[PDB]
Design an enzyme around this catalytic site. Structure first.
Site, PDB file in Angstrom:
ATOM      1  N   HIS A 172     -18.646 -80.393-135.302  1.00  0.00           N
ATOM      2  CA  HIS A 172     -18.965 -81.744-135.750  1.00  0.00           C
ATOM      3  C   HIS A 172     -17.774 -82.694-135.659  1.00  0.00           C
ATOM      4  O   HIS A 172     -17.956 -83.893-135.429  1.00  0.00           O
ATOM      5  CB  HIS A 172     -19.475 -81.676-137.190  1.00  0.00           C
ATOM      6  CG  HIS A 172     -19.885 -82.993-137.763  1.00  0.00           C
ATOM      7  ND1 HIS A 172     -20.817 -83.811-137.164  1.00  0.00           N
ATOM      8  CD2 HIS A 172     -19.515 -83.616-138.902  1.00  0.00           C
ATOM      9  CE1 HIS A 172     -21.010 -84.879-137.911  1.00  0.00           C
ATOM     10  NE2 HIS A 172     -20.233 -84.785-138.974  1.00  0.00           N
ATOM     11  N   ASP A 206     -20.021 -89.501-137.842  1.00  0.00           N
ATOM     12  CA  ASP A 206     -20.757 -89.094-139.045  1.00  0.00           C
ATOM     13  C   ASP A 206     -21.264 -90.347-139.767  1.00  0.00           C
ATOM     14  O   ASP A 206     -21.884 -91.207-139.113  1.00  0.00           O
ATOM     15  CB  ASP A 206     -19.800 -88.199-139.821  1.00  0.00           C
ATOM     16  CG  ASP A 206     -20.461 -87.490-140.971  1.00  0.00           C
ATOM     17  OD1 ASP A 206     -20.978 -86.379-140.752  1.00  0.00           O
ATOM     18  OD2 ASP A 206     -20.449 -88.044-142.096  1.00  0.00           O
TER      19      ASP A 206
END
Ligand SMILES: [Ca+2]
Lengths: 297, 298
Positions: A277, A107
Site C-alpha cells: 500500500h 490513501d
C-alpha cells in the site's frame, strides 16, 4: 522527531478551518502531496526531494492529521469529509498563491484529491492518486473477502467512542500493525524508523485518533454519498490523472484499478508498482519516477 | 459475587473429548438444550429457562470456550470453534446425559452451532429454534456497505490474532457493554438484568475467553462459511421442524424477511418477529418463552 525533509521550509497555513502544516521545498510549478492513514506528511520524505528538483513541493498534513489543526467534528463528520478537506486545502493553497496546482495523494489524501478533482477541477493541472479506488468503489465491492481485507473501513466507522476506546488501550500496536500489514513485506522494514516515530507519535494523541475515526466515519457516510451522486450522475474527473497502485496494495484486491478509474476519469493512465500500500516508502524510486514523468507531461 | 439466576436449576460439568461443557439443568420432560451466543453466557436464558422448565428438561449450556465451559486448544483452522466442531462436542455432551434426540434452541453463535448441528446430524433433533440469525453463509453473501457497517465485528473479530485480542483488551468492559447496548431496541443496558450483565462482563474480562470468541468469529469467516457453502451448493436443507424468531430491531432483519431466507435452508420452518432487538430472551422474555413452548410442544 527527525526532520526528514532537509532544506524544505515549514509553513503553518491558516485557513477558515484551522491551520494546515506543510513542508515546502523546491521550485517550479506547485505540487501538493497529501498523505493518508495512519501517516503524516513525512511519508513523502523519500520522494519529495526528487520531486523538489522540478516542482515547488508542498507536503501538507491533512486537516486534523499530523500537526495540522483538528477542526471540531460534528454529527455528519463534516470537516473530515473529503469534500470539506478538499475545500480547506484549496483555501490553504490560495494562501500561498496557488490557485492552480498539481496534486498527488495517497490513501486518505488520494480520496481528498479525487474529490477535489470532482468538486473543483479548475484548481488542478494534473492529479495523481496512489493505491486507491474511489470510496464508492470500495463500498460497492464490499463482499466477504474485501470486508475481511479492509475491515478497518467498517471498524473505524463505528460510532464514537467505540473505535476510540479500543484504540486507546495500545495505540502503538495498532498504528504499527496497520503500517506492517499493508507493506509487501508484511513488517515495518520498508519504513524509515524516524518516519515510524512520526506516525507513532501522531497516533499517540487521543484527539488525533478520534479525527482518524471521524475521517473513516465520513468515509462510510458522507464521502460515500458524495461519490455516489457523482457516479450515478456520470460525473467524471476531467483533470488528467495518474492512478498508481501497488501490486500487493489495497486498490488491486477487489478490482482492476485502471478499469475502475476509467469509470471515474475521462483521462487516466495507470501503472502498477511492485509494492504494498505504501508506494512512496516501499517503492520510492519507482514512485517518484512515475510522478516526475506524469507531472512533467 | 455472581448471582444465581436459575433458582431450582442444578449445575452440570459435562465431560466431552474436547473438554467440559458447563450447564444449568432444571425441569423434567423432553430434553431441551439452550445455546447462548456472543458476548453472553448461558445466563442470558435466565428469564426464559424457568418458563421452559415447566415442560422440558432444560439444559442451559455454555458454548465450548464460553463462560465456564472449557476452552479447547484452537489450531490454525480454528477447528474447535467451528460450528461443526462445537456441535459435535455438544452432541457428545448431550450423550453423556443420555440425550441423543433433543430439542434445541440457540441464539446468536449458539444458533449457528444449532443449525449446523441440524445440518450435520439432523437425527439428533426433535425440533430446532434459532433466535435472530440467518445462516453464516447468508450474512457473508449479503455483505454490503450497510451490513458491513452493522455487523462490523464479523470482519473485525475475524482479523488474524493478536489484532482483535489486543484492541478488545484496550477496553473490554466497554466493549461487551457496548455490544450489549447497541443491539437492543432501547440502545442501552436497560433491558438486561444487572446481575446477568456482571456475568457477561466477567466472562469478557478474561483475555483467553476473548481469544476464543475471536476464534469463533475466525471460524465464522472461514470454515463455518465453507461448511455452509457446501450445503448451499448440494441443496442440503434442515429437515427438522424449525422455528426462526428474530427481533423486529435485530440483526437478522433488514429488508428481506428472515423467514424467506430460512426457507432456502429448512424444509419445515415457521417464523415470527418479536418486538425486540437482538437479545430476544432478555428484551422480550415472555414473548420468546411463549413462542418456544408453543413450538416445542407441537
Ligand atoms: Ca476506556
Amino acid at each position: 522527531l527527525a526532520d526528514l525533509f532537509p532544506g524544505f521550509g515549514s509553513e503553518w497555513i491558516n485557513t477558515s478551518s484551522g491551520r494546515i502544516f506543510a513542508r515546502v521545498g523546491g521550485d517550479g510549478p506547485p505540487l501538493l502531496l497529501l498523505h493518508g492513514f495512519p501517516q503524516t506528511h513525512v511519508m513523502w520524505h523519500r520522494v519529495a526531494p526528487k520531486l523538489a528538483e522540478r516542482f515547488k513541493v508542498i507536503v501538507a498534513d491533512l486537516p486534523g492529521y499530523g500537526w495540522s489543526d483538528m477542526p471540531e467534528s460534528d454529527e455528519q463528520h463534516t470537516p473530515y469529509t473529503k469534500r470539506a478537506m478538499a475545500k480547506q486545502l484549496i483555501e490553504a493553497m490560495e494562501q500561498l498563491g496557488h490557485v492552480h496546482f498539481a496534486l498527488a495523494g495517497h490513501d486518505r489524501g488520494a480520496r481528498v484529491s479525487y474529490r477535489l478533482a470532482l468538486d473543483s477541477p479548475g484548481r488542478l493541472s494534473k492529479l495523481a492518486v496512489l493505491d486507491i479506488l474511489p470510496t464508492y468503489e470500495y463500498w460497492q465491492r464490499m463482499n466477504r473477502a474485501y470486508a475481511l481485507k479492509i475491515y478497518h473501513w467498517s471498524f473505524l466507522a463505528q460510532p464514537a467512542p467505540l473505535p476510540e476506546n479500543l484504540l486507546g488501550g495500545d495505540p502503538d500496536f495498532y498504528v504499527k500493525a496497520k503500517l506492517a500489514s499493508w507493506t509487501r513485506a508484511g513488517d515495518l522494514s520498508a519504513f524509515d524508523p524516524r518516519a515510524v516515530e512520526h506516525y507513532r507519535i501522531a497516533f499517540a494523541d487521543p484527539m488525533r485518533r478520534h479525527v482518524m475515526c471521524e475521517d473513516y466515519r465520513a468515509g462510510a457516510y458522507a464521502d460515500f454519498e458524495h461519490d455516489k451522486i457523482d457516479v450515478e450522475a456520470g460525473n467524471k474527473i476531467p483533470v488528467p490523472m495518474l492512478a498508481l497502485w501497488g501490486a500487493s496494495g489495497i486498490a488491486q484486491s477487489a478490482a482492476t484499478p485502471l478499469d475502475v478509474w476509467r469509470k471515474w476519469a475521462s483521462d487516466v493512465q495507470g501503472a502498477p508498482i511492485e509494492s504494498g500500500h505504501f508506494l512512496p516508502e516501499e517503492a520510492p524510486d519507482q514512485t517518484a519516477e512515475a510522478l516526475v514523468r506524469f507531472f512533467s507531461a
